């Protein structure tokens, strides 16, 4: 019967499920693609020059009020006065550039710094009189007099826009407003100032800040928990939406990249600096051998390398995700008892200290349990075929375990393992080998009964019959 380790893997593989025809929080559930279409419903975008595959947009920071600011009512019916104008401070300008960079990283847009003034396609400025929201922007389908503008509230009562920084609301606000200027709408038909919207007004269940920075709703609505942090950069559904609009950026981070601790991304939101770092990010990466390094955390973590999957990292829930179309190869756990789930390619998974559960999935994986009693789980023969077996790099008999309980043959076929020294043409025969000189071992199983191994696992260290579950 399926062990608890196998059950934990299965449960996490199906965590944060999306799609289908059942109600979730009183709303229909949408897949990433369905949500992306919803976010793009306005059908507004900047036009690329004929033939150009890359859209180039400039930006500038206003130094004085413009026509809209002076006479709002001539452009929008609801706004009569914006109060007093103020230019973006150095802090705001620096943070704005990081937000713009986070959008250009994922799609084919090149942002050009046009400096101080009103010459940029995109412009930024502050206002002091509350218009029912922290900031506002215009979608690209408005008159040239309003196109590309985003405005931010700064007054004695509201200070979130004064100090934007990685992980805070001010930084997410910049990313959110820039998203509007590029053509993205909120995931549902709601807006600050129009009635009194709540999550009950969302069109689909996944309209939360766990999936889109364009959402107004807390991540807890969908089961995630960022402990007060806010995503600084585009999330899973934002990436899907913007790429459908301007294309996927296939040159971003094409080298071997490390996310988390020891990051070489040069992106504040992808970097962990201490065991206290609250990470919230969705990985966009165009190539190379990449690694999710979460070695510096001591909390129990659940890491899933499959595209579109969410992971529970550094004490938060559903805070790390991998964008659709991205292949991340390796993952390193921390000192807690972690769950590491690989994907279809060859992965290097390292559990570190703690009693970890590792699941390589398809491909010939290199698995390191590290210190502690680790369990290497298998759910299908194909996951470690005789032709491309996994290698358990630091197996310690009596401590670690090889778990085969979830295989169909044992759960359903009622097969019983019979250890022998040579195959004789009988299903279920297994050969456990160990060369004490090289310290290399092996487990080979003939499930078909043709005297040819169908499943095999290479070992560095000895494994005994007592180390193999079911």
């Amino acid at each position: 019967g399926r062990s608890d380790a196998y059950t934990q893997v299965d449960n996490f593989l199906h965590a944060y499920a999306r799609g289908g025809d059942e109600l979730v929080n009183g709303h229909p559930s949408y897949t990433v693609d369905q949500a992306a279409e919803q976010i793009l419903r306005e059908q507004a975008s900047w036009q690329k020059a004929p033939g150009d595959s890359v859209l180039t947009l400039s930006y500038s920071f206003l130094t004085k009020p413009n026509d809209f600011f002076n006479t709002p009512w001539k452009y929008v019916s609801d706004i009569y006065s914006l109060g007093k104008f103020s230019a973006f401070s150095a802090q705001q300008q620096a943070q704005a550039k990081l937000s713009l960079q986070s959008w250009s990283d994922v799609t084919n847009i090149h942002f050009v710094d046009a400096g101080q003034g009103d010459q940029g396609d995109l412009t930024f400025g502050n206002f002091s009189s509350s218009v029912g929201g922290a900031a506002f922007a215009f979608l690209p389908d408005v008159p040239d007099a309003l196109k590309g503008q985003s405005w931010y509230l700064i007054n004695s009562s509201y200070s979130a826009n004064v100090n934007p920084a990685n992980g805070n609301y001010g930084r997410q606000t910049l990313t959110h407003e820039i998203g509007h200027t590029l053509g993205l709408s909120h995931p549902g038909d709601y807006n600050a100032g129009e009635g009194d919207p709540t999550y009950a007004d969302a069109t689909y269940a996944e309209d939360t800040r766990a999936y889109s920075v364009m959402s107004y709703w807390e991540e807890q609505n969908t089961g995630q928990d960022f402990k007060g942090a806010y995503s600084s950069a585009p999330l899973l559904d934002d990436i899907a939406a913007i790429q459908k609009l301007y294309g996927a950026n296939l040159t971003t981070r094409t080298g071997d990249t490390v996310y988390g601790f020891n990051s070489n991304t040069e992106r504040d939101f992808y970097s962990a600096t201490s065991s206290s770092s609250k990470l919230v990010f969705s990985v966009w990466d165009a190539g190379g051998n990449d690694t999710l390094d979460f070695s510096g955390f001591s909390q129990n973590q659940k890491i899933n390398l499959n595209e579109k999957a969410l992971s529970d990292v550094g004490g938060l829930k559903g805070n790390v995700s991998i964008a659709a179309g991205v292949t991340v190869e390796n993952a390193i756990g921390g000192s807690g008892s972690d769950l590491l789930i690989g994907n279809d390619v060859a992965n290097v998974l390292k559990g570190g200290a703690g009693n970890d559960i590792l699941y390589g999935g398809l491909g010939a994986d290199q698995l390191w349990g590290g210190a502690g009693a680790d369990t290497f789980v298998y759910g299908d023969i194909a996951e470690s075929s005789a032709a491309a077996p996994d290698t358990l790099r630091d197996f310690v008999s009596g401590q670690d375990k090889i778990d085969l309980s979830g295989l169909d043959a044992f759960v359903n076929g009622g097969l019983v393992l019979q250890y022998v020294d040579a195959f004789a043409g009988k299903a279920g025969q297994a050969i456990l080998s160990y060369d004490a000189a090289s310290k290399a071992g092996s487990l080979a199983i003939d499930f078909s009964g043709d005297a040819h191994a169908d499943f095999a696992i290479n070992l560095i260290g000895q494994a005994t019959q007592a180390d193999i579950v079911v």
């Binding site: 929008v76 609801d78 218009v131 922290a134 215009f138 509007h180 600050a192 100032g193």
Partner: peptide, 4 residues
Amino acid sequence: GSNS
């Protein structure tokens, strides 16, 4: 038209 003023999207917050």
